[PDB]
A paper describes a structure:
The light-producing reaction catalysed by the Renilla-type luciferase is one of the most widely used biochemical reactions in molecular and cell biology research. Here we track the role of dynamics in evolution, starting from the evolvable and thermostable ancestral protein [name]-[name] which catalyses both dehalogenase and luciferase reactions. The regions encompassing the L9-α4 fragment and L14 loop are important structural elements that line the main access tunnels connecting the buried active site to the surrounding solvent. We conclude that the LUC activity benefits from conformational dynamics of the protein’s rigid scaffold to allow binding of a bulky substrate.
The most potent insertion variant, AncINS, has both an insertion and a substitution in the α4 helix. These mutations markedly improved substrate binding, linked to changes in dynamics of the cap domain, but not the putative catalytic pentad. The asymmetric unit of the crystal lattice of AncINS contains two monomers (chains A and B). Chain A has a structure similar to the [name]-[name] template but features a π-helix bulge in the α4 helix where the L162 insertion and F163P substitution occurred. In AncINS chain B, the α4 helix is markedly distorted towards the α5 helix. In AncINS, the inserted L162 occupies the same position as the bulky F162 in [name]-[name], making the active site cavity of AncINS bigger than that of [name]-[name]. The F163P substitution in AncINS disrupts the α4 helix because proline acts as a helix breaker, introducing a kink into the polypeptide backbone. The resulting distortion closes the main access tunnel in the chain B of AncINS. By contrast, we detected conformational flexibility of AncINS, accompanied by 1000-fold faster binding, based on determined k+1 and k-1. The HDX-MS profiles show that AncINS was deuterated more rapidly overall than the template [name]-[name], and that the modification of its α4 helix backbone leads to greater solvation and more pronounced dynamics, particularly in the cap domain region.
Author numbering: 11 to 307
Write the structure that this text describes.
Amino acid sequence: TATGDEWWAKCKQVDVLDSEMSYYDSDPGKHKNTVIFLHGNPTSSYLWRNVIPHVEPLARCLAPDLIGMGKSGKLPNHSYRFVDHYRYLSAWFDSVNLPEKVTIVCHDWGSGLGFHWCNEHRDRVKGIVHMESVVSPLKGWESFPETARDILPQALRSEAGEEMVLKKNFFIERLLPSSIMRKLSEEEMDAYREPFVEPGESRRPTLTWPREIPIKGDGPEDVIEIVKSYNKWLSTSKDIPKLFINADPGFFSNAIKKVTKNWPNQKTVTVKGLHFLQEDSPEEIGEAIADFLNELT
């Protein structure tokens, strides 16, 4: 199912600041119940292709490609830091005729952006669904999941990051399949490869993202402070219904379950998967989001 071109034929484009962003939108401009799906690294809105159909009968579903990723525009200055993504994503939020409140569904760096957007736009949030998410700064390279303890310091956050990612597409060719339980069809793999076909700066988003991970003591301090701030808000957010979709065995999920154990007003459902759990349990994730929306209403 689902070529890259079939998925992106369903998506529209919108000008955003000095560039353009691609996004899925099941109901352009409608102010009915609305859900926004945010992917992370190194994926795109394609990641949600099998989840969204379970939610669409209840809600307008939007799923943007983050700037520099999917079919969204590439930036000539190739500056793809968290604050740069948040600039373009915030403008996108203001450009797609959203209703007064929305539910955010987010994954990985999509949750970093989504949690931050929510923290800055608190009266626009009717619920948050998060999975394999960025819920806290990390204490050190020790609190990272075991399969990546060495991958993140050495290599990507090093001088060697450029050659592994920009030249040999390490995040797409190695990391992505390494945290999916099944093996992707080459159709699905080509859909993930398409935004980063050309070697060089086109792949810079997949290298800047691991360099943004908030490691206390290392940095970056600006992301560390963004994450601490929205963690503080989330941990006392009694009025914001939350659904944590726990991946078993997961990647970040074990650590997230601990960070969020006492978060008020958070329900947990568990599904099978590693980090990219949408590729192993999209049906269960979609039906859990559908249940969550019905509880909100």
